[PDB]
Design a binder for these strands. Structure first.
Ligand SMILES: [Zn+2]
Lengths: 197, 416
RNA sequence: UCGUCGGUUCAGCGACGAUAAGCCGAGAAGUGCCAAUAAAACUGUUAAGUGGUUUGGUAACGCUCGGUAAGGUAGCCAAAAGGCUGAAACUCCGUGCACAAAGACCGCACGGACGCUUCACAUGUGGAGUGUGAACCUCUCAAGACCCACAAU
DNA sequence: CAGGTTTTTG
DNA sequence: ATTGTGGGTCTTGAGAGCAAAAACCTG
């Protein structure tokens, strides 16, 4: 239950600065996934002889270790990223121990996670659908000098138009989403996930 | 010295039943896969630890001080010997070398996210170093392969007194290669034991190393599958695809029928989620792959044969990296990379240099008058040049252009 | 019409099997059922309240390893063990070396004949190669694209 | 001792 | 049919296809 909408322009700012922000957040998300995999590997005791107590589960330890380095990402987005990595490791731990599948890996052009609280959509009278995204944390706001909710214009047509209209009406409930980039089409897209009865 | 591979079927084990030999081989496959995956895991842990140590101290940590071994492979072997004791130590060492070399050669790509960390599959070939294989010809004509497939603890456990001996069917071209191996003309390199699941046949892929002006032009034509034209000689050669088009029609009809029937309900087929509902399609797909492989062998052999026939010491052919965009040839969705690699290594055996050129308006250009026109091509088959009124098959003109030395640069100059 | 064996891949040929696009068996990460609400993020002076959905145990619809039809084979002696003989697969003949059920045997070597296809020389002669024909570096991993299930249309 | 055969490591 | 999402395969490429010293078994 996911639909992809491509963004023609960021409403608040230009394309160059928005793309710089997006690629910085992509780098931070990739680092978070790799570090969360390393910390889940250490947590399970799979580490070698040459290679931390105080946390109930691996997710909290990984988050509290990584959040210093990934200060740009919104904390909820960082938690969702780290949870994704630790879920993959918990799903593949037995195969890792048996020497079946080696180590989980994540692509350079990684999706940017967005918790349900960081996504909103509204419709201007002009006819442009505007998506408001909480992409950055407060130190990132101070450094980049940008507002919390970045607004982007999304083209919404056909089945996508029906889905977005159902979201606006309240029938479709938004959930955790992603911001991906397609190199072949060289376009930034939002994968919005929706749930309903 | 080139390296080639020939497979000899294992028909029976000597002094062992087939049940015991099959169990031994399946187990050794399990430790082979375990060793590969865990060696990759150890390489990855060392990468992460080195990054963290560089962050803390500002320099790379030496493995000799921390791991105890100057290389990651030593530590990997030390860790794996405990749980891969059944594998012969040389085979285990070479398998771990495979895994760690693959990780090391591609470390930057994995670090920057270009490439995933390698993962190895269950049906993995059993590695055998050169010393772990010997072959002897009996007086009554049989060929016996003595393989060190087991370690001393494993030899004691299954009560295998000496190297495991099997009878290998050595026939045809395999007979000539094996006789050259025994004579010492061929040297055996690291080889493998694989299992063809279609025929349920175990093969010993012996890898053996050995010491092995005019330009041909090859054009992947539109009406002819492949076409060869030579410089300094009006000689013409071609490969049509009647077998390809007939086979293509048959396998297209079969895939459509299979995919249509797969949606219809089936009890025993649908009971199992995967490897059932998939076996019939995999069978036909493997048949198509084998046919394409054999056809590419025949084509590359014909091409190189005519290269020696007319003394062409160099072969030029289109770099398909750009052709992939148009993909409108007589061969539809063909394994062009396979065919090109076959042509390359067979020519290199023959002693012929292979050079790839850009397919930059080679069909549009006239090989006689050197005139490039977008509208020069007239019709789907023929080619007519106005500047000199040259009438020839389009494939012939394209291959003649390809055979011209530095033709891509000349075309680039003519464009600008 | 599709497969099996006849050394490997694609065709042919011989002999066979097809309900195999078929049927069936056990273990197990997804999916479902129980408890069970852990990280993390917020609003809020705090409190408090939300979204978020974790940890073990189960089953087996889906999942993982598997099984399942397919060429043909000569008998005696000896208490038994063992011995002798020497059958059957893609031309035939002779010799020699092998071999008593068998996933494991039907083979190999030499000589001759016959057939084929390549060269050379004046249809014929000589030389060469081979026994159905053509070929016979593969393995591994990744990337990009393709296949199956799902939502909107 | 002698010679392969594993084993371990660069 | 077309966009995606969740699980699996083609065609392209790349790398490889170890070596040396010593202890153990054997002779
Ligand atoms: Zn012309």
């Amino acid at each position: 239950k996911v639909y992809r909408y491509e963004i023609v322009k960021p409403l608040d700012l230009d394309w160059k600065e928005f793309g710089t922000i997006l690629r910085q957040l992509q780098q931070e998300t990739r680092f978070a996934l790799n570090k969360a995999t390393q910390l889940a590997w250490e947590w399970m005791g799979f580490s070698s002889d040459y290679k931390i107590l105080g946390y109930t589960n691996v997710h909290g330890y990984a988050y509290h270790t990584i959040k210093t380095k990934a200060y740009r990402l919104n904390s909820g987005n960082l938690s969702q990223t780290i949870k994704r990595a630790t879920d993959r490791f918990k799903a593949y731990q037995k195969e890792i121990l048996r020497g079946d599948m080696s180590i989980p890996s994540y692509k350079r052009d990684i999706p940017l996670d967005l918790i349900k609280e960081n996504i909103s959509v509204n419709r201007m009278n002009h006819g442009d659908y505007i998506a408001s995204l909480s992409l950055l944390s407060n130190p990132a706001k101070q450094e980049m000098n940008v507002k919390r909710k970045i607004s982007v214009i999304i083209i919404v047509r056909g089945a996508g138009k029906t889905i977005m209209d159902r979201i606006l009406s309240g029938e479709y409930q938004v959930s955790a989403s992603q911001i991906i980039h397609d190199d072949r089409k060289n376009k930034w897209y939002l994968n919005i996930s929706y749930d309903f009865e | 010295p080139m390296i080639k591979v020939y497979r000899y079927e294992i028909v029976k084990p000597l002094d062992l039943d087939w049940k015991e030999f099959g169990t031994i081989l399946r187990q050794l496959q399990q430790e082979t896969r375990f060793a590969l995956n865990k060696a990759t895991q150890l390489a990855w842990e060392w990468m992460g630890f080195s990054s963290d140590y560089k962050d803390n101290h500002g320099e790379y940590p030496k493995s000799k001080d921390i791991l105890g071994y100057t290389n990651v492979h030593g530590y990997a072997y030390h860790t794996i010997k405990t749980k891969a004791y059944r594998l012969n130590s040389g085979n285990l060492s070479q398998t771990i070398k495979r895994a760690t070399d693959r990780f090391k050669a591609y470390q930057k790509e994995i670090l920057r996210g270009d490439m995933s960390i390698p993962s190895y599959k269950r049906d993995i070939p059993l590695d055998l170093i050169k010393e772990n294989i010997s072959v002897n010809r009996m007086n009554h004509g049989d060929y016996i392969a003595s393989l060190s497939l087991l370690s001393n603890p494993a030899k004691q456990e299954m009560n295998v007194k000496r190297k495991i001996s099997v009878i290998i069917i050595v026939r045809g071209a395999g007979k000539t290669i094996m006789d050259r191996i025994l004579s010492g003309e061929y040297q055996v390199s690291a080889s493998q034991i694989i299992h063809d699941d279609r025929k349920n046949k175990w093969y010993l892929n012996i890898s053996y190393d050995f010491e092995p002006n005019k330009i041909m032009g090859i054009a992947l034509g539109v009406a002819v599958a492949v076409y060869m034209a030579f410089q300094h000689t009006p000689a013409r050669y071609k490969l049509e695809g009647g077998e390809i088009e007939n086979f293509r029609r048959q396998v297209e009809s079969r895939r459509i029928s299979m995919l249509r029937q797969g949606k219809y309900a089936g009890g025993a087929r649908g009971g199992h989620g995967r490897d059932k509902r998939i076996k019939p399609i995999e069978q036909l797909r493997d048949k198509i792959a084998n046919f394409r492989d054999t056809t590419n062998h025949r084509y590359s052999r014909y091409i190189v044969d005519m290269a020696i026939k007319e003394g062409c010491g160099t072969i030029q052919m289109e770099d398909l990296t750009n052709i992939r965009d148009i993909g409108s040839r007589f061969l539809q969705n063909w394994t062009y990379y396979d065919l090109q690699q076959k042509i390359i290594y067979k020519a290199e055996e023959a002693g012929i240099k292979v050079i790839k050129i850009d397919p930059q308006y080679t069909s549009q250009r006239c090989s006689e008058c050197g005139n490039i026109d977008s509208g020069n091509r007239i019709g789907q088959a023929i080619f007519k040049c106005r500047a000199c009124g040259y009438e020839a098959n389009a494939d012939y003109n394209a291959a003649r252009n390809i055979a011209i030395p530095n033709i891509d640069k000349i075309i680039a100059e003519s464009i600008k």
